[PDB]
Design a protein around this ligand. Sequence first.
Ligand code: HEM
Ligand SMILES: O=C(O)c1ccc(Cc2ccccc2)cc1
Ligand SMILES: [Cl-]
Length: 393
Amino acid sequence: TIPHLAIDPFSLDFFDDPYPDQQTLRDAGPVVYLDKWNVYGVARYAEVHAVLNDPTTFCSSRGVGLSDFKKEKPWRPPSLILEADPPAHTRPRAVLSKVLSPATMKTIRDGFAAAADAKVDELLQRGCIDAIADLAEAYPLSVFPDAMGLKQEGREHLLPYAGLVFNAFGPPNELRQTAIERSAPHQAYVNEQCQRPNLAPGGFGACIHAFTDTGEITPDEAPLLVRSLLSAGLDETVNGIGAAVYCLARFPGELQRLRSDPTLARNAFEEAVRFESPVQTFFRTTTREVELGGAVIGEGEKVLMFLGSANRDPRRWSDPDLYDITRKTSGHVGFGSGVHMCVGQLVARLEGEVMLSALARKVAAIDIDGPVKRRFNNTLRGLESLPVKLTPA
Ligand code: HEM
Ligand SMILES: O=C(O)c1ccc(Cc2ccccc2)cc1
Ligand SMILES: [Cl-]
């Protein structure tokens, strides 16, 4: 009843161009079986959304990667929020929801916006830049580690550790094995910065430790919660920003619309998150026999969700392959959906908005003027290099 496909969604061929195989996965049926890794797959919006919003049946505590924590040892101590189910997930989630809250965004928005304007002004003096290294990577690195309260030394570990985390969600392929092989120095840095004395007052990390006297988390839980904010947030925001720049370069009519109304900056970034989906895939594990899409999935089975495919499903989106900064993007699963829906989404939207705002006000044209190179990751989609010429407005 369930079609079996040999598509490897973690192969370099798939990463280079996933969209034809994603239609093949969508059109084969609501539920497929991937023989390469012995997992179930769902690539349509309806089933991805249904799985995300049933955390009791499709749990996260057995891992959101390929590895089943009931069968294998996690490569690092499990996250207290990402790899936890209700009710254990609830109170750590509440703390992070209060640390990265709407009220907290008010305290950081002016400095985030000023740094975005300053970076665009700096890049416009150079003219020809790499929109990945010099913009998509440089800007988050210029605001987020300071907002965390991290010291200056050792920040070069942040990008490798982020890429390692997302590669480790993948299958035991070469990308995952080499990442873990080189991981020891990055883990040692990250774990040490999670201790309370190493987090500057007023920052995100110090605020997490401050919640330890409320009864929501204990002091021994705070280091691992800080680790969450040093694992997530960087690479996805970098890829989302680089994707927005790539789209404004490939779709010049949308840059012109954004220039004419810079208040479209926030939705322009949200559409880039849907269009690119920096987090392409992750897993759930069934806790019981479940009926999904006419399929009887047994207990203890890994289910692979294709977030980027769900965000391009023509059953849900009109013209899904078009970048439209005025599209009604509400309902996209680029940040997930349900109880685990990205708790840092306000930080990501703030960074993306103020960067696209600076571009909208200061830049007249964005033209690719060099070879575009893709960055390969088991979980993340994004570019490695995006040579562009920025024309001042
Ligand atoms: C464009 C930027 C981002 C994207 C596309 C993204 C994507 C996602 C997705 C899809 C999930 C759901 C995970 C799941 O359901 O298993 C998630 C969760 C999470 N994200 Fe993000 N994220 C982004 C930015 C950030 C930022 C800026 C932060 C922190 C400052 C962050 C921290 C987290 C955390 C801690 C979780 C776990 C939440 C939970 O399990 O309840 N993310 N993210
Ligand atoms: O260490 C953590 O708690 C943590 C790490 C990464 C992420 C981002 C993500 C991971 C897998 C699937 C979708 C998104 C969230 C939380
Ligand atoms: Cl670690």
